[PDB]
Design a protein around this nucleic acid. Structure first.
Ligand SMILES: [Mg+2]
Ligand SMILES: [Mg+2]
Ligand SMILES: [Mg+2]
Ligand SMILES: [Mg+2]
Ligand SMILES: [Mg+2]
Ligand SMILES: [Mg+2]
Ligand SMILES: [Mg+2]
Ligand SMILES: [Mg+2]
Ligand SMILES: [Mg+2]
Ligand SMILES: [Mg+2]
Lengths: 273, 93, 131, 86, 63
RNA sequence: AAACUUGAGUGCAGAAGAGGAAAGUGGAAUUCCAUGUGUAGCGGUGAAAUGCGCAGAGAUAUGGAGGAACACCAGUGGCGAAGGCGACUUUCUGGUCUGUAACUGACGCUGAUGUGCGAAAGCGUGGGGAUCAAACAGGAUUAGAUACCCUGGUAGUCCACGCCGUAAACGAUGAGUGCUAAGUGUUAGGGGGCCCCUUAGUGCUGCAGCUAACGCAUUAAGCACUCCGCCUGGGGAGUA
RNA sequence: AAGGAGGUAAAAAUGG
């Protein structure tokens, strides 16, 4: 899974990478591609509103079926492919009527395997079902919050959640974060865990590789000036020098909770992370 | 290689639903080149302890002979998935 | 495994003599039979019988006890061994117990006693001491 | 290996009919057993206890091969080329 | 003394023979010791395995 | 150079086993969470206190979460080279013992160097985390108490994959082989009439012999042969 | 009846 580079240079020293053995086709499905120009963290006013985004390799977008709403028709896993837009890999599947779609690639999905969706689908990896029909204790991913909107939860590499119980209109689920919350039982989920489990272990190794990923450098608050940052100024190095560490925009940033009050989901959230 | 498979169906099962369930699982145990030598029912019996809050259970016995255990494994997988079968066990001989 | 049949035979004789047994059965071989014949001729044992059965045959020794139940064989000692073999010249032939004992020897003229080795003026491999 | 496969191997390699103790028969059966245990270990890597018996079989086959090579070089060469154990 | 199985000649014990297993099970459900039941060790092993099978299949109780 | 079947393996018919590896199922119990009842203690000790609890603890009933170990069987019992192996089920797999006498015909023993396994603690990466618990905090005891005791409590204790390679890793008893009184149990077998004989283990008692003595004594520490390892006063030192 | 092996409770201030 993980390949460790030899220290031929100080740049490569301690660097690692995925071996991409899971990938079975190295080019994408042409008809499922769309252009994805970079925003570099700049909004519709043309202003930088999120720091540290910019540059990086050009990417095409792969249209991904998060909805899994094509029910009662088998689809055969043509290939597992790399996708630059997300940590998970993606499986190109071919339905029995000849329509082709990308899905998040679950752990253990193999080329030639069959997947299905709907209330009658079997409980096996890659099948999509309403939480109504998914048994208690099952590990799932790509979970909807609103029926028919498409999966929004547990889509990263290695992500999964566990079905815990079934109230009347809602099913209890334990999310990767540890939160236990209710989700409408008409919402769908895909059986299994998202694949590419070694993603998090990669040692990026050098600054340039982050740059290829489109991440620009993070300048620490303490090495700016007072007009730049609450931590700026001071002669020589200085400690934080106030009761709490502060964000660049002057808000406390260590332990201060920011979840807004009076949210609709607060009565659905059973146990915080 | 022979196998005796014993399973328990929940007491609160309709007659037709139980008939369909037993037929389905007998067919499963027959599928993978495994010949069902003989299937029988011991009726509803009192359980020595509550299983899923049930004091009774419909006991089904099946004998099947096979050269592998694919049918038995599929039976066990579908019995774990099922919410109608409470207990199951497979004995070689 | 077995590595010295002659030592095994001598130890069988010693153990039987200690327990004051009358007879002793062991697997046979030509060297063992010659040793037993020398013992009989010298008077340390009573009789020797050979059983020409299958599996190399059997030797059946009969031990000799004097008056007062005194043991005629006082002791047997293996001299030459697989781990270290001992040879002596005719003029260097050892006397066991100042002559009161025998040294069984193996010579070009057959396995004989030290007295015969000295008489014939020959040496050889000193198989054992008996007294 | 199954007794049926063992019977097949001994029939194939026996020097004469009714021969079960020949070095050829013993070492062919040992080759089959060694291969079966190797295939088992490939899946069950951490089965040291099984691997120990495997090594005992390997050493027994080695000693049988040494004896056969000492007694009849041509038979030894023929057997090793037949079994692919060199 | 004598062993029930050795005397009766039965050379196999079926875990579904709850009436027979009740003979060697205690009042509270524990397996009676061999030195008390008189059974042989060979069949005591078979009995223990059968009793545990029955416990798993809920034919017999644990406690 | 040529033969033999007694050692060593093989075939044939049988036996038991917590031997190992991987998946799955299960009951008891502990901790925690929620809720109903309920009042002022609980817990703990030699005696206490810290601590928890009037915001409702502890007790009790129900449900849920999760980790870990398998009560009775269980036995000088079994298995394994040793370390070790105890819920149940399935798959893969190692070894051992019994009888037989087709089969090979000495092919055996030991084993420096080598190569593997190896309790617990410990190390790395990633998981997991109930219980217990180094460190640590508080209370007690005490002349003092860096403890024993009490209340907590992190690593760790569990899993995967690597590493480490050590223990009073002991029977403080190297392996192989044969021989040398007996009595009596038990595990797995076999043969001849509850009895006798017999194979392999596992215990106890006890001759000859051995031993400084204690003791060992067919499971030798007796009598012998082969090979290996090791010792040569106590410290210094398993150190430089 | 007297000796050998395994497990297993309950008790406990401190200094001579
Ligand atoms: Mg940033
Ligand atoms: Mg500056
Ligand atoms: Mg400022
Ligand atoms: Mg400052
Ligand atoms: Mg300064
Ligand atoms: Mg450890
Ligand atoms: Mg403590
Ligand atoms: Mg040491
Ligand atoms: Mg030692
Ligand atoms: Mg014995």
């Amino acid at each position: 899974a993980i390949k460790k580079y030899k220290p031929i240079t100080n740049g490569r020293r301690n660097m690692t990478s995925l071996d991409f053995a899971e990938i079975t086709k190295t080019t994408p499905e042409k008809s499922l591609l769309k252009p994805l120009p970079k925003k570099a963290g700049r909004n519709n006013q043309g202003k930088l509103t999120v720091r540290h985004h910019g540059g990086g390799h050009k990417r095409q977008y792969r249209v991904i079926d998060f909805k899994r709403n094509k029910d009662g028709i088998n689809a055969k896993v043509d290939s597992i492919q790399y996708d630059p837009n997300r940590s998970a890999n993606i499986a190109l599947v071919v339905y029995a009527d000849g329509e082709k779609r990308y899905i998040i690639a679950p752990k253990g999905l193999e080329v030639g395997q069959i997947v299905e969706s709907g209330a009658e689908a079997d409980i096996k990896v890659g099948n999509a079902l309403p939480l109504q029909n998914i048994p208690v204790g099952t590990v799932v991913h790509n979970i909807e919050l609103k029926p028919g909107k498409g999966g929004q939860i547990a889509r990263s590499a290695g992500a999964s959640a566990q079905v815990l119980g079934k109230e009347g209109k809602y099913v209890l689920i334990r999310l990767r974060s540890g939160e236990v919350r209710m989700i409408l039982s008409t919402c769908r989920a895909t059986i299994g865990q998202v694949g590419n489990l070694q993603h998090e272990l990669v040692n990026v190794g050098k600054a340039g590789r982050s740059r290829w990923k489109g991440i620009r450098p993070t300048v620490r608050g303490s090495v700016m000036n007072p007009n730049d940052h609450p931590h700026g100024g001071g002669e020589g190095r200085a400690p934080i020098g106030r009761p709490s560490p502060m964000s660049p925009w002057g808000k406390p940033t260590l332990g201060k909770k920011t979840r807004r009050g009076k949210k609709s989901s607060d009565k659905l959230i059973v146990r915080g992370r | 290689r022979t196998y005796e498979v014993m399973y328990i169906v929940r007491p609160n099962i309709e007659e037709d639903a139980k008939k369909a369930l037993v037929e389905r699982f007998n067919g499963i145990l027959a599928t993978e080149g495994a010949e069902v030598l003989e299937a029988k029912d011991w009726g509803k019996r009192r359980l020595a302890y509550e299983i899923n809050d049930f004091k009774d259970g419909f006991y089904n016995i099946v004998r099947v002979k096979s050269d592998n255990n694919k049918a038995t494994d599929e039976f066990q997988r579908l019995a774990k998935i099922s919410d109608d079968i409470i207990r199951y066990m497979v004995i070689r001989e | 495994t077995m590595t010295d049949p002659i030592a095994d035979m001598l130890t069988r004789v010693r153990n039987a003599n200690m327990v004051r047994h009358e007879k002793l059965e062991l697997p046979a071989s030509n060297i063992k039979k010659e040793i037993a014949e020398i013992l009989k001729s010298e008077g340390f044992i009573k009789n020797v019988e050979y059983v020409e059965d299958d599996k190399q045959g059997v030797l059946r020794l009969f031990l000799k006890y004097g008056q007062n139940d005194e043991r005629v064989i006082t002791g047997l000692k293996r001299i030459s061994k697989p781990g270290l073999r001992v040879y002596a010249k005719a003029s260097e032939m050892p006397k066991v117990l100042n002559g009161l004992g025998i040294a069984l020897v193996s010579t070009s003229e057959g396995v004989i006693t030290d007295k015969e080795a000295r008489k014939r003026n020959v040496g050889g491999e000193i198989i054992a001491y008996v007294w | 290996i199954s007794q049926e496969r063992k019977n097949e191997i001994i029939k194939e390699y026996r020097v004469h009919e009714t021969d079960t103790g020949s070095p050829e028969v013993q070492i062919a059966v040992l080759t089959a057993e060694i291969n079966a245990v190797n295939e088992h270990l490939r899946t069950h890597k951490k089965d040291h206890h099984s691997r120990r018996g495997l090594l005992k079989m390997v050493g027994r086959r080695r000693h049988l091969l040494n004896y056969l090579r000492s007694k009849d070089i041509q038979r030894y060469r023929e057997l090793i080329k037949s079994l692919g154990i060199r | 003394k004598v062993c029930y199985f050795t005397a009766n000649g039965i050379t196999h014990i079926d875990y579904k023979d709850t009436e027979l297993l009740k003979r060697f099970i205690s009042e509270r459900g524990k397996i009676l010791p061999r030195r008390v039941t008189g059974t042989s060790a060979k069949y005591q092993r078979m009995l223990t395995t059968a009793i545990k099978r029955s416990r798993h299949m809920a034919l017999l109780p644990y406690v």
